[PDB]
Design a protein around this ligand. Structure first.
Ligand SMILES: *[C@@H]1O[C@H](CO)[C@@H](O)[C@H](O)[C@H]1NC(C)=O
Ligand SMILES: *[C@@H]1O[C@H](CO)[C@@H](O)[C@H](O)[C@H]1NC(C)=O
Lengths: 14, 189, 180, 191, 180, 14
């Protein structure tokens, strides 16, 4: 039904 | 046993006055040290511990990651609240009040009267004790709010009394799931 | 002051290689994604009739975590987490009435890392009948919370014990419960 | 009420195998965030949070503070350990054991036998329960070590039983302040 | 493993302008310097007959603390501490037996900042006869500990309560105790 | 004086 939005993860230069 | 390493990303939305005011917080924890975070109220990432400097500096350099984060208050926080407001913000379950003394002692000795409030939701609540219509403001020992973990709460509030014939005690509960306060009495047997 | 708080919490832990994804509202879990069955699990079935969530997003978000942990580990120079033992406490759902159904709650609080063994004991014997549990819920102090439930029938003849095992504990901690 | 601000300097000496190995830690806490620290195992100050950057960089510049800090393991830690070891590391206070059943009922019903151990030091201790000469390995609920704050500890260990006539239960406690373990029994008596 | 730990902890708190200096061995306080009477105070009398400490060093070190707090404050941009409420619990020294002296202990745990008001209440009335307390002991998590003692004579006619007030508390917390 | 307890002395930052 209505949708829950998740916060997309991103990597990190190492 | 070998050592462990824990990475924990936590995004939290805080709401004031419905959704008139929202605050987003992108937090990151390494083991037990928060290393970097974005606070909508600030506008950019900040390193809490030197460990996050590399990321705070980088993520701050890229515009898309900054815009993504700055819009979160709307595109994420506000959206989600509207998606669950029905079964969370508006969820209401009525308390179940029971009054009883602990220890079945003869009259005129010291005693402890228990007001067991259970099964409710939300957790906001107000329990008060009265003796013959007059509010007792001292001698109350409470357990505080207890989260049962299944979307209901419970709490106990006791009053120390020295019961005398014909005294009538009353536990009065107040909760958003009830228009007029619930009450339950106990008469000095 | 604030009115409500919604938190999207997740985590990855090595060497265990165990992760988790979940949403929390004012302290309660709305749902969490099952990593092995790759499907979203609501806390109360009703919730599922109002909202929805694509389980895939979680599984993906977890992989990015496994990767960033391996980076932060090295970057931390391999300093590990220091065990923080749990604060167990056994409770009862609703007040107790002999021979009328109820539920024993085992509250394991303020501990880390998110790895714990819990066993229900009835008169010294383990029990599995209808027992259930929640995933690791987060806390403000970067620590964890967890609940274990055991449905039972109150009586004067039985005694119960919740047995908790955690790396920050010197040895198994037992929490006792018995009708009085 | 106005807000509060807390500055907390903490210096800790950790000893291993006596004084065979020591480690010093100069810690500084602002409110609840450690800002900067010195670890003898590293040799120089480091900023834990960006707040400590200024001092960690500064203090490292003055080769006079580094000396004080690097030598502390001897001039401070080991010194003090010698000054107190007699009344701390060597401290020994005998436990006081008492055994009693909570719930005074008729025999033959489930009960809880409590063994209370009080007033001992140091904290290391072992409590065991025996029924008719055989050690019981299950049904024991302990409270764990409780620090009374006055240089003594206490603990309680209960045993879950269903006492019958002629049964004798013994609580046995092992502690460095006692050459041969302490035991106190309780003869299954219907009360 | 780790055998022992000695800790020299101190602190300064503004606006209150209150400080503290003490030594800790494996959790127990060895001594602390009385900021007002300017004299070192041994936790246990006997200790004094074994070592010594020049109270002046402490008062000097505190002065420096007051200064550094005013710097760190400004440097912090004036962000204050967030109150953390205590975990009160009342206990008894040794097992209770009618008509044999004893002592009630009031454990005030895991709280901050180091300010707390404690009152012993017997049958609702405050009590000062022989009560004693300890300074603020430190804890790993940068929080505090504290103990309050009340010698008393066991009886079935009385009831006690430890009343604790802390800025992180919504209101007075009452811990009950009574022989039965 | 009995054996003495050494304290770690403090000094400041500008
Ligand atoms: C849980 O039990 C298993 C099996 O004995 C063991 O491998 C593991 O170490 C235990 N976990 C904890 C936290 O004690
Ligand atoms: C301690 O008591 C004083 C006097 O009642 C009061 O001003 C103060 O608010 C109390 N402190 C706390 C933390 O409750």
């Amino acid at each position: 039904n209505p949708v829950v939005h998740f916060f997309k993860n991103i990597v990190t230069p190492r | 046993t070998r050592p462990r390493f824990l990475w924990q990303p936590k995004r939290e939305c805080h709401f004031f006055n419905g959704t008139e005011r929202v605050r987003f917080l992108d937090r990151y924890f390494y083991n037990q040290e928060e290393s970097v975070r974005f606070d909508s109220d600030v506008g950019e990432f900040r390193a809490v511990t030197e460990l996050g400097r590399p990321d705070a500096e980088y993520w701050n350099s890229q515009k898309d990651i900054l815009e993504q984060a700055r819009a979160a208050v709307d595109t994420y926080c506000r959206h989600n609240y509207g998606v669950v407001e029905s079964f969370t913000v508006q969820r209401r379950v009525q308390p179940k009040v029971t009054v009883y003394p602990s220890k079945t002692q003869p009259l005129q000795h010291h005693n402890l009267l228990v007001c067991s409030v259970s099964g409710f939701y939300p957790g906001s609540i107000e329990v008060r004790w009265f003796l013959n219509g007059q509010e007792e403001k001292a001698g109350m020992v409470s357990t505080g709010l207890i989260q049962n973990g299944d979307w209901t709460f419970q709490t106990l509030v006791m009053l120390e009394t020295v019961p005398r014939s014909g005294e009538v005690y009353t536990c009065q509960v107040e909760h958003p799931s009830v228009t007029s306060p619930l009450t339950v009495e106990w008469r000095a047997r | 002051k604030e009115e409500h708080v919604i938190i999207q919490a997740e985590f990855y832990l090595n060497p265990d290689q165990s992760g988790e994804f979940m949403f929390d509202f004012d302290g309660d879990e709305i749902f969490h994604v099952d990593m092995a069955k790759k499907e979203t699990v609501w806390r109360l079935e009703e919730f599922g009739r109002f909202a929805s969530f694509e389980a895939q997003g979680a599984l993906a978000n977890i992989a990015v975590d496994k990767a960033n942990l391996e980076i932060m580990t090295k970057r931390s120079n391999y300093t590990p987490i220091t065990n923080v033992p749990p604060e167990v406490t056994v409770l009862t759902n609703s007040p107790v009435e002999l021979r009328e159904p109820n539920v024993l709650i085992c509250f394991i609080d303020k501990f880390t890392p998110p790895v714990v063994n819990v066993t229900w004991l009835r008169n010294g014997k383990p029990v599995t009948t209808g027992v259930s549990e929640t995933v690791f819920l987060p806390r403000e102090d970067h620590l964890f919370r967890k609940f274990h439930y055991l449905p039972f029938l109150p009586s004067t003849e039985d005694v119960y014990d919740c047995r908790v095992e955690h790396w920050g504990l010197d040895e198994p901690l037992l929490k006792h419960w018995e009708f009085d």
